[PDB]
Write a protein that holds these residues in place. Structure first.
Motif, PDB file in Angstrom:
ATOM      1  N   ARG A  81       0.837  -1.198   0.000  1.00 16.35           N
ATOM      2  CA  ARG A  81       0.000   0.000   0.000  1.00 16.35           C
ATOM      3  C   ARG A  81       0.872   1.250   0.000  1.00 16.35           C
ATOM      4  O   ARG A  81       0.513   2.297  -0.549  1.00 16.35           O
ATOM      5  CB  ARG A  81      -0.911   0.008   1.230  1.00 16.35           C
ATOM      6  CG  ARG A  81      -1.993  -1.053   1.197  1.00 16.35           C
ATOM      7  CD  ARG A  81      -2.631  -1.208   2.553  1.00 16.35           C
ATOM      8  NE  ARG A  81      -3.742  -2.160   2.536  1.00 16.35           N
ATOM      9  CZ  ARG A  81      -4.401  -2.553   3.624  1.00 16.35           C
ATOM     10  NH1 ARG A  81      -4.057  -2.074   4.821  1.00 16.35           N
ATOM     11  NH2 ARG A  81      -5.401  -3.425   3.518  1.00 16.35           N
ATOM     12  N   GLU A 119       0.435   1.773  -6.384  1.00 10.57           N
ATOM     13  CA  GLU A 119      -0.872   2.397  -6.554  1.00 10.57           C
ATOM     14  C   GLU A 119      -1.891   1.659  -5.703  1.00 10.57           C
ATOM     15  O   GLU A 119      -1.549   0.707  -5.001  1.00 10.57           O
ATOM     16  CB  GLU A 119      -1.302   2.341  -8.019  1.00 10.57           C
ATOM     17  CG  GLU A 119      -0.390   3.100  -8.975  1.00 10.57           C
ATOM     18  CD  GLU A 119      -0.624   2.722 -10.446  1.00 10.57           C
ATOM     19  OE1 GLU A 119       0.024   3.330 -11.330  1.00 10.57           O
ATOM     20  OE2 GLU A 119      -1.447   1.816 -10.720  1.00 10.57           O
ATOM     21  N   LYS A 120      -3.145   2.094  -5.763  1.00  8.45           N
ATOM     22  CA  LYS A 120      -4.198   1.461  -4.977  1.00  8.45           C
ATOM     23  C   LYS A 120      -4.589   0.098  -5.538  1.00  8.45           C
ATOM     24  O   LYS A 120      -4.646  -0.098  -6.758  1.00  8.45           O
ATOM     25  CB  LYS A 120      -5.424   2.374  -4.898  1.00  8.45           C
ATOM     26  N   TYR A 121      -4.837  -0.832  -4.621  1.00  8.63           N
ATOM     27  CA  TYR A 121      -5.241  -2.196  -4.942  1.00  8.63           C
ATOM     28  C   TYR A 121      -4.098  -3.064  -5.444  1.00  8.63           C
ATOM     29  O   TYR A 121      -4.265  -4.274  -5.599  1.00  8.63           O
ATOM     30  CB  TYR A 121      -6.366  -2.177  -5.985  1.00  8.63           C
ATOM     31  CG  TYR A 121      -7.616  -1.437  -5.548  1.00  8.63           C
ATOM     32  CD1 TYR A 121      -8.282  -0.577  -6.430  1.00  8.63           C
ATOM     33  CD2 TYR A 121      -8.149  -1.616  -4.267  1.00  8.63           C
ATOM     34  CE1 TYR A 121      -9.447   0.080  -6.051  1.00  8.63           C
ATOM     35  CE2 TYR A 121      -9.316  -0.963  -3.877  1.00  8.63           C
ATOM     36  CZ  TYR A 121      -9.961  -0.117  -4.772  1.00  8.63           C
ATOM     37  OH  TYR A 121     -11.129   0.517  -4.393  1.00  8.63           O
ATOM     38  N   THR A 168      -8.230  -9.468  -1.777  1.00  6.65           N
ATOM     39  CA  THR A 168      -8.152  -8.601  -0.646  1.00  6.65           C
ATOM     40  C   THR A 168      -7.289  -9.370   0.306  1.00  6.65           C
ATOM     41  O   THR A 168      -7.696 -10.374   0.891  1.00  6.65           O
ATOM     42  CB  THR A 168      -9.524  -8.240  -0.071  1.00  6.65           C
ATOM     43  OG1 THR A 168     -10.000  -7.083  -0.767  1.00  6.65           O
ATOM     44  CG2 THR A 168      -9.436  -7.929   1.409  1.00  6.65           C
ATOM     45  N   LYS A 206      -5.335  -5.511  -7.862  1.00 11.50           N
ATOM     46  CA  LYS A 206      -5.635  -4.489  -8.855  1.00 11.50           C
ATOM     47  C   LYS A 206      -5.964  -5.083 -10.228  1.00 11.50           C
ATOM     48  O   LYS A 206      -6.847  -4.592 -10.927  1.00 11.50           O
ATOM     49  CB  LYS A 206      -4.467  -3.513  -8.983  1.00 11.50           C
ATOM     50  CG  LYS A 206      -4.754  -2.336  -9.906  1.00 11.50           C
ATOM     51  CD  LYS A 206      -3.524  -1.472 -10.094  1.00 11.50           C
ATOM     52  CE  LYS A 206      -3.912  -0.093 -10.579  1.00 11.50           C
ATOM     53  NZ  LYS A 206      -4.752   0.605  -9.556  1.00 11.50           N
TER      54      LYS A 206
END
Lengths: 226, 226
Positions: free
Chosen positions: A27, A31-33, B11, B46
């Motif tokens: 994180r 980038e995000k995810y 996740t 992602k």
């Protein structure tokens, strides 16, 4: 990106911690995810810790998991634990994929932050691991360890308190590290277990804090991002 | 025994919970240090979450992660999440190893405890997953979900308070549950997310508490131990 392979089970608690650091570091770096592909082989700790063939049997298990990870696609492998590193060379000879040593990862970070003398903390076992202390010093550092009396106390705390999330004796661990800073002038401390990081963070002592497993996962993710 | 395979990264947070339960359960069922072999494939979220090919793309990623685990030696595979179960059937088709659905597992444990009518709590997407609710009802159960007003509130507390380990509004959730006990007469509650179980346990409510993720892992471990 190179797929990461981790041999765990060498105490699931330890593997659990690596994964957490893996999440944090990702994180923070991308980038995000975004999380770089990571594969884990968690071995049955019972057939490892209490092996009738000692390290001769342990090496077989580690190599086995390592080959499994390769078959799954791991291009970069590593041990999510300390003792397994006692036979790093043997395992690497049979692993057809580069392996990243926790010792190399820590010594690199330590030397990079400019420190040359450190206090090695962890369980009585990790504070008496000759190969660990010896391999670390050959890199260009001087490792100091608490007296046999402080090792039993620090070990008790980790087992009876930190292992449960109880920071009741945190201050005691802080004085231990500040003592050697004024005693043998250490410039940093090494957290050789995944339980110690919950009690001592960077801004808790006058010296540099080296979260061993965290540094390891950062190297893995660093090389994996190349 | 039968090596366990888990498709994760859907996740990492959710995968961390599964591996945590794995440890917890193993310590409850077997002797010390004993942990059944488990392989975990953590995908790049992602590429999954924001896949330009939609589910067509996600299925490819899930099937590939499954084939990776199969090469590593996994004989039993499962998703470490809920939503990916929307294409469970599609994945099983292309996987030469039995997979275990979370629904089946939760539905079997729910029916085993005697309840036939339960409250399905969790994230907003969890209390709205038509696929989940339907598949759960066809198993011979009566599923009831809170109203939109209570959904937003509960989810809010989940994505805010609970997520950050803040169990201040635990009593609110406890009331909501015992509320439906008398309201639509439920006999149990399902916790679809991995956060909710952190604020709700057994001796808390009058109904039966079902940890969706925990129940899934017990199944996995049970079938792998036979």
């Amino acid at each position: 990106m190179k797929k990461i392979g981790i041999i765990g089970g060498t105490t699931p608690e330890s593997t659990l911690y690596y994964y957490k650091k893996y999440i944090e570091i990702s994180r923070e770096k991308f980038e995000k995810y975004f999380y770089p592909e990571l594969i884990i082989y968690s071995i049955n700790f019972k057939e490892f810790f209490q092996n009738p063939e000692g390290w001769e049997g342990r090496k077989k298990i580690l190599i086995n998991a390592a080959k499994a990870l390769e078959r799954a696609g791991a291009e970069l492998i590593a041990f999510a634990a300390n003792t397994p590193h006692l036979v790093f060379d043997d395992v690497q000879r049979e692993v057809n994929v580069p392996m990243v040593s926790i010792i190399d990862a820590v010594a690199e970070e330590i030397l990079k932050r400019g420190v040359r003398k450190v206090l090695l903390l962890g369980t009585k076992t990790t504070m008496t691991a000759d190969f660990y202390i010896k391999t670390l010093e050959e890199k260009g550092l001087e490792v100091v360890v608490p007296n046999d009396e402080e090792k039993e106390e620090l070990n008790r705390i980790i087992f009876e308190e930190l292992a449960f999330g109880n920071l009741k004796n945190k201050e005691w661990i802080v004085r231990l590290i500040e003592k050697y800073r004024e005693s043998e002038g250490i410039e940093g401390v090494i957290l050789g277990c995944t339980e110690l990081p919950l009690a001592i963070k960077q801004g808790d002592v006058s010296v540099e804090v080296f979260d061993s497993a965290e540094i390891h996962m950062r190297k893995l993710i660093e090389l994996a991002s190349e």
